Every structure is written in structure tokens, then in C-alpha cells.
């Protein structure tokens, strides 16, 4: 009965949520096809949004004029690091100890920093000083209080690749590459009590959700197809790059599951990492802008 907007609480979408708020799994990498009867089973109106003079939708009829678009999802075969959180992921990874889940601080030290969190609960500027001191103090240590210190290697960064200068033979310092699956399985161990001691929340923003497992698809209404002269359908940038995602995705599942020449997995993995980075931000750093065959960069 006619309420108004009280507040807004930002956070991070969880994989669990994305599956219920999705209307259908997009699977057919194609656009319209062609000049008559434009109805497919993947990215276009598969209970997603209506734009043509055909009334079909998700049971509600509701013609293209005044019809809020519905979201979709894509079940990604492998985990994928989100580029936007990269810098923060570094602060998490090299400040805690692996296998335990502790913040590499004794209980006593942990206990007293709690009292600086209620006295500062409104001023965003002066809390950033206090987070970084914990950050800086944890980075210069090697003695966890719950694994007996077994010599903790140091992490690397920049732009999205990670390493750890370990020892394995007698004194070597090879650079073992890091895979998103590896990283993800290491963050789910960090208990919920420790997230306030970092820069996170226990319910709204879990750290493990930063590694994209399901990509939500924008609706049809937000992806319009502009026409050039009078018969040409100059497809939308969003649509093309999404189509590009499914074309590499579809070969990906079929190429690892059947034959396994191992080499393909290395090349294919980083390309997907490369490709998703452009979808989030085409003007990213260190990433060749994936343009359409005309020279015009995709926005």
C-alpha cells in the first residue's frame, strides 16, 4: 500500500541468488537470423525480454511496449577471477595463513582491536588508516599461531596472475602459477568471525563470491538492435561480446571433457580470463580491446 524507498544496502551477488533470479540458461550463440521469424532458443526471447510483434514471453504475455526485461545466467564450467576486486584479493591472500583461517595475530591482539570498531562506525575516512596498519603488520610475518609456522612464501600480483616463491627441492624458488580454482578453495576456510577484522561482511559479501562462477546475462530490453540505413541490423555491442562468450564456452566444455591433450587447457583458460575482462571493462589495463570488425571499440 504505497511505500517509499527507505534505504539501499549494497553488496555482492552470490552464485546461489543468481540461479533463482535467472529465468533461463542461455545456450545458443546466435542473434536473430534472418529477415523473418526472429525466434531462437538461446540469447533472444527465451523468456528474457520481448522486442518483436510476437506476444510470447514468460506466461505474462506483456507486449514489448512496457515490459521490464528479465535476467538470465550462464553456468561457467570453471571459476574466473573478477578483475574489479583483484587489488583487494591481494590484501586478503597475503594477510592470512593457508589451511588454518586465522589472521596471523594472537587472540589478545585481535581482542583489543575490536574496541576501535564501535567508536569509528560512521567515518569512512579514518577507518581506512586502521585497516592498512593491520594489513602492513600481517605482511611482514611468517609465524601463524595455529599451524606452528611452516615457512610461508610470499604472493605476487599484477595484472591478474598470482605466484608464490616457495621451496620444494632443497633451496629452489620456482614461480608456481596460480589458478582461480586454487585461490577460491583457499578463501572458503576463512571463518565468518574474521571478516569484520578485514574489510568484509558475513552475510552480504562473502570473499569466495569474488571468483565469478555464474555470469548474469542482461535482459533484451537493455540490448537494443539499432538499424543502419533501412534493412541492416547493426547488432548491439553487448550482444556480440556475449555471443563471443558462449562460442568459447561451448567449445570449452566439449574440448576438456572428451580428449585431454593438457596443452589446450592452458591457452583456453587465460583467453576466457582475457575475454571476461573486456566484458566488465573494455578500457582495462594490459588488455587489447576486443573490437568488432569495423575498428569501432565496443562500449
Amino acid at each position: 500500500m504505497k511505500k517509499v524507498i527507505g534505504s539501499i544496502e549494497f553488496g555482492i551477488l552470490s552464485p546461489q541468488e543468481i540461479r533463482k533470479m535467472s529465468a533461463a540458461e542461455i545456450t545458443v550463440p546466435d542473434t536473430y537470423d534472418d529477415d523473418g521469424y526472429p525466434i531462437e532458443g538461446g540469447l533472444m526471447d527465451k523468456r528474457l525480454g520481448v522486442i518483436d510483434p510476437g506476444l510470447r514471453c514468460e506466461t505474462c504475455g506483456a507486449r514489448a511496449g512496457e515490459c521490464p526485461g528479465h535476467f538470465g545466467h550462464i553456468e561457467l564450467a570453471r571459476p574466473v577471477i573478477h578483475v574489479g576486486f583483484a587489488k583487494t584479493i591481494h590484501r586478503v591472500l597475503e594477510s592470512t595463513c593457508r589451511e588454518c583461517g586465522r589472521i596471523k595475530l594472537t587472540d589478545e591482539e585481535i581482542e583489543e582491536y575490536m574496541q576501535k570498531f564501535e567508536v569509528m562506525g560512521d567515518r569512512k575516512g579514518a577507518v581506512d588508516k586502521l585497516i592498512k596498519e593491520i594489513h602492513k603488520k600481517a605482511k611482514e610475518r611468517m609465524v601463524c599461531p595455529h599451524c606452528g609456522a611452516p615457512q610461508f612464501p610470499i604472493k605476487f600480483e599484477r595484472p591478474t596472475i598470482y605466484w608464490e616463491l616457495r621451496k620444494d627441492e632443497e633451496g629452489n624458488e620456482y614461480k608456481h602459477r596460480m589458478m582461480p580454482s586454487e585461490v577460491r578453495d583457499r578463501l572458503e576456510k576463512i571463518p565468518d568471525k574474521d571478516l569484520p577484522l578485514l574489510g568484509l561482511h558475513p552475510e552480504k559479501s562473502r570473499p569466495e563470491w569474488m571468483v565469478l562462477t555464474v555470469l548474469p546475462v542482461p535482459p533484451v530490453t537493455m540490448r537494443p538492435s539499432i538499424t543502419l540505413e533501412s534493412g541492416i541490423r547493426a547488432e548491439d555491442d553487448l550482444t556480440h561480446k556475449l555471443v563471443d562468450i558462449i562460442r568459447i564456452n561451448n567449445r570449452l566444455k566439449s574440448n576438456i571433457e572428451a580428449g585431454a591433450p593438457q596443452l589446450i587447457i592452458e591457452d583456453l583458460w587465460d583467453l576466457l580470463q582475457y575475454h571476461v575482462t573486456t566484458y566488465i571493462n573494455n578500457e582495462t589495463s594490459g588488455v587489447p580491446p576486443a573490437k568488432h570488425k569495423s575498428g569501432r571499440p565496443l562500449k
Binding site: 608456481h176 602459477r177 580454482s181 578453495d185 576438456i256 585431454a260 593438457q262
Partner: peptide, 20 residues
């Protein structure tokens, strides 16, 4: 090929390790 498909499943269950 048949051997290696089995090892990707145990890699996905956290029971097999490899270093390049």
C-alpha cells in the same frame, strides 16, 4: 586420454596435485 580424464575429477575433488 582415459587415464587423464580420471585425474581431472580428482583434481576437482582436491585429492590430486601437480606442479608444472
Amino acid at each position: 586420454n582415459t587415464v587423464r580424464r580420471i585425474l581431472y575429477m580428482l583434481n576437482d575433488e582436491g585429492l590430486a596435485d601437480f606442479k608444472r
